[PDB]
Amino acid sequence: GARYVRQVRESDKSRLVSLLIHGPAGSGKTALAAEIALKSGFPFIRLISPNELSGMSESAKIAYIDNTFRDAYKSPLNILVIDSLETLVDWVPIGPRFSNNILQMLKVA
Amino acid sequence: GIHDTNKQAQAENSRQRFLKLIQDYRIVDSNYKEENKEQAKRQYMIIQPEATED
Ligand SMILES: Nc1ncnc2c1ncn2[C@@H]1O[C@H](COP(=O)(O)OP(=O)(O)OP(=O)(O)O)[C@@H](O)[C@H]1O
Numbered sequence: 001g002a003r004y005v006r007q008v009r010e011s012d013k014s015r016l017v018s019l020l021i022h023g024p025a026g027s028g029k030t031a032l033a034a035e036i037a038l039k040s041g042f043p044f045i046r047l048i049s050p051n052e053l054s055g056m057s058e059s060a061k062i063a064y065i066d067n068t069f070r071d072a073y074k075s076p077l078n079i080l081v082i083d084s085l086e087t088l089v090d091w092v093p094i095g096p097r098f099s100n101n102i103l104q105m106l107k108v109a
Numbered sequence: 110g111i112h113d114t115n116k117q118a119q120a121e122n123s124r125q126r127f128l129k130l131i132q133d134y135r136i137v138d139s140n141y142k143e144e145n146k147e148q149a150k151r152q153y154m155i156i157q158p159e160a161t162e163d
Contacts, residue, residue: 095157 001036009077030083037079044075049083062105069109
């Protein structure tokens, strides 16, 4: 993680790097993500987590997410953490059923 | 049949047979309930026809 952080810090051509952190349930992933983010020491750090979104309507969600990407385009060094993608998009295997719009917004973002 | 042993015996035989019938009915019902569950599990434990109207 530290290597990647330095790489983004220094490079002039690589202007965007994205990572996946995957593993079994209960392995303790978000802790690692947060620790990397803190120790990185950038000016600008934000978090998107399901917890903030409970009770809102769909349009509200897409608005919020759009906002949270837009506000990060100041401050020339930035870090965002997205937590638990599958639950953000409303996955349940029986149908399967889920919300396609949110999925697209994230895909394009 | 309270006052005649033979009548009482007949009554008890009928009771026994009727109890056995009740047991047969119960067994059939339970077996069928257990089988209806399996078919229900079969049908929807898989990817599904394309999504509904609205
Ligand atoms: N070596 C470790 N690295 C990270 N977290 C650890 C470690 N040892 C213990 N923990 C504990 O892990 C917890 C945080 O784990 P985390 O929130 O990532 O779980 P999770 O697997 O993402 O949860 P869920 O699967 O429900 O989403 C904290 O209680 C933290 O103290």
